[PDB]
Amino acid sequence: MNAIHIGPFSITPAARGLHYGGLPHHQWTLYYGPREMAIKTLPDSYTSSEVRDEFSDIIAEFVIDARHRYAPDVLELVNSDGDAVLARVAVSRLPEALSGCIPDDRFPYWLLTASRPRLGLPVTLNEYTALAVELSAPPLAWITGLLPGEVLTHDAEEWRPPTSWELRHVVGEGSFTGVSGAAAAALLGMSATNFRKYTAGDSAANRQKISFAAWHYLLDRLGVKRAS
């Protein structure tokens, strides 16, 4: 019938039509970006909702995969022996001082990495709080795996504005963050229509690009990047 925009996914049916059995059908294809995903022939009688829920399985699968693909690292605060884990913190970016390390009886507290090659640092509790404050991962940080490095840099010269697809990951509809367009507009402090010029693409009319500060504050409010 036409493509259904759910999250960054587009359920695009084929223009040609067939009649499997005695019923009409259509080749519906799930696109994540310019890449197709799972494709299933849906009978013409199927409702748009049916189409969406039908592909919902693939949709959910992708979301789960992405979350796992970009799950943030986790540092463990352990005791002097190192076997018992007193605390676990999901880090955004590993500290810049840890090295091949194993807890020593000398120090009461040690920070280590979740992986086998345990690289870490012996820190006290206040330094542990300082490190957890400056390097914590926001709850939806895995979406930063799906975004390129140019749209996530804090340097404006290396910063590239997000496209319609990259913005359309996390603004409205069944997004990965789950928020709506009006909610994302109210987070950025402006009305719904001015954010609707940001969301809608196609021609250059009503295609103002979001600024660097607004994009990073929106990422802060959605808990995707810089939200410690």
């Binding site: 091949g100 020593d104 000398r106 640092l121």
Partner: protein
């Protein structure tokens, strides 16, 4: 801040070759170049039921039905030829050096501190006591494990190869050099100085060690036993196979290495039993009991961490043990 590295992989020093076994007669050892190799052969065994029963197999009729069906196996045995009372065993040992340098490491600061600790140890007391003890373990045929136990006479020749030719030959008598006493001998001091030069990186040391043991004519020799997947029948169950390379029975190289590592006389329990192998937590598999328990803080890991991080240098015999553990290599670090 000097934490222990998460990986501290160490390449083993004293790398042994696989010890080939041949057979011949005594006093023909000087012409033992073309001796026929010991060949692993098959022999069939049937056996009575002889393990301890669990108080329900102790019924008379059921045990009678048990003995009426003896169990059948085909065991691989290694026997001398009947015109041969002497077993010859040949291997080569490579002494590398650089014992304190890990092959893989994570923390470069910990690696540099461990390198400085090992270099400090070499500076006051170089590789002399450990090399003398390794020379003693070469001198007695401890690599003939059950294989010099009932031997009338054991002899060991250790040759030094330089450019494909022999440099220094060390003919010994393994009956005199005991398996418990680490005494001093001039030829043993010369072999200790050669292993000292190998372990300190002064030169390359490759030693060809040949042991002749007088067991008996056509008697049983004891090579390394392999692993059986048990994919056959029950009559020819193949319950025991012995290791060989090319139609020639042999001993595993790691068994020879564990024989040379039996120098550890500094475990906190009583040393009247004798030396045990160089290993973390002093674990001999025959006794099933670990000397150098981590409760007593005399194992390798606690002593190494106290030596490197806290700079608590242990007793001199214990740092000998720690550096011998570094010589034997390992996957020290987090596991």
């Amino acid at each position: 801040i000097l934490s222990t590295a998460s990986v501290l992989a160490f390449e083993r020093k004293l790398d042994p070759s696989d010890a080939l076994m041949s057979a011949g007669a005594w006093a023909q050892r000087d012409a033992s170049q073309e001796w026929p190799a010991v060949t692993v052969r098959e022999k069939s065994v049937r056996g009575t039921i002889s393990n301890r029963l669990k108080t329900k197999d102790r019924d008379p009729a059921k045990l009678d039905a048990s003995i009426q069906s003896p169990n059948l196996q085909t065991v691989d045995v290694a026997n001398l030829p009947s015109d041969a009372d002497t077993l010859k065993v040949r291997f080569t040992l490579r002494v590398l050096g650089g014992a304190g340098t890990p092959s893989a490491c994570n923390d470069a600061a910990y690696r540099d501190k461990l390198l400085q600790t090992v270099a400090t140890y070499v500076n006051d007391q170089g590789f002399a006591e450990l090399a003398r003890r390794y020379a003693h373990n070469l001198a007695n045929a401890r690599f003939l494990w059950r294989n010099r136990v009932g031997a009338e006479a054991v002899e060991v020749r250790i040759n030094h190869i330089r450019q494909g030719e022999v440099a220094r030959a060390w003919r010994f008598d393994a009956l005199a050099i005991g398996l418990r006493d680490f005494k001093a001998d001039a030829e043993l001091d010369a072999l200790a100085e050669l292993i000292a030069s190998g372990l300190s990186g002064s030169g390359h040391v490759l030693l060809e060690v040949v042991a002749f043991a007088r067991i008996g004519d056509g008697q049983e020799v004891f090579p390394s036993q392999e692993l059986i997947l048990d994919k056959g029948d029950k009559k020819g169950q193949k319950s025991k196979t012995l290791y060989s390379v090319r139609d020639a029975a042999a001993i595993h190289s790691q068994k020879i290495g564990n024989a040379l590592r039996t120098i550890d006389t500094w475990y906190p329990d009583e040393d009247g039993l004798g030396p045990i192998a160089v290993e973390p937590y002093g674990s001999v598999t025959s006794q099933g009991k670990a000397y150098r328990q981590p409760k007593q803080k005399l194992d390798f890991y606690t002593l190494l961490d106290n030596w490197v991080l806290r700079d608590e240098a242990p007793a001199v015999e214990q740092q000998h043990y720690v550096i011998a553990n570094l010589i034997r290599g390992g996957v020290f670090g987090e596991a």
